[PDB]
């Protein structure tokens, strides 16, 4: 038989092979692991979502619940001033919004609403002048 196997991480963050067979006729067995480094949008996507600081947590929670189909943002969510699409690796998206939706001395947060990402992918947006 063969005394080696090629196994890889896939774009779903699983092994491509759920089974390895080792023949008793093999003295030694060689496992070659590859990490292609490519993840599909459904497991590793990003967006950019803008809210008042106080509205972040509610918007993120309802955003996770809204699903990939809604770019992990609740449809017509009043707390969301602007958001991009959820994009995968090598992709781009742009969003334009009215600056009149911002007020001076208010705290604004941006985050990714892709489930679990708000913890790591956050920042502050400030109105200036």
Residues at the interface with a copy of itself (CB under 8 A): 1, 3, 7, 9, 12-15, 17-39, 44-48, 50, 82, 84, 87-100, 102, 104, 110, 112, 117, 120-129
**In Å, what is the CA distance from 125 to each residue of 5, 27, 30, 51?**
50, 62, 52, 9
**From candidates 46, 74, 79, 83, binder to Cu ion by CB under 5 A:** 46
Three-state DSSP class for 15? strand
- Least spacing, CB of residue 88 vs a copy of itself, in Å: 6
User: Using CA atoms, how far apart are residues 59 and 108, in angstroms rounded to an integer?
Assistant: 13
The one segment of 39-47, 60-68, 74-82, 92-100 that binds Cu ion by CB under 5 A: 39-47
Q: 46 forms bridges with which residues in the sheet?
A: 87
The one segment of 21-29, 61-69, 102-110, 116-124 that binds Cu ion by CB under 5 A: 116-124
| Of residues 87, 88, 55, the one with CA closest to residue 74 | 55
**Where is the binding site for Cu cation, in residues?**
46, 112, 117, 121
**In Å, what is the CA distance from 115 to each residue of 50, 63, 72?**
16, 8, 8
Q: Binding pattern to Cu ion, positions 83-112, x when CB under 5 A?
A: -----------------------------x
């Amino acid at each position: 038989a063969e005394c080696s196997v090629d196994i890889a991480g896939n774009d779903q963050m699983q092994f491509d092979k759920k089974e390895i067979t080792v023949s008793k006729s093999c003295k030694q067995f060689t496992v070659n692991l590859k990490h292609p480094g490519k993840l599909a949008k459904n497991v590793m996507g990003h967006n950019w979502v803008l809210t008042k600081q106080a509205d972040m947590q509610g918007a993120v929670n309802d955003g996770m619940a809204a699903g990939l189909d809604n770019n992990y943002v609740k449809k017509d969510d009043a707390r969301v001033i602007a958001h991009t699409k959820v994009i995968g690796g090598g992709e781009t998206d742009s969003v334009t919004f009215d600056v009149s939706k911002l007020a001076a001395g208010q705290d604004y947060a941006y985050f990714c609403s892709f489930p679990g990402h708000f913890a790591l992918m956050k920042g502050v947006l400030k109105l200036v002048d």
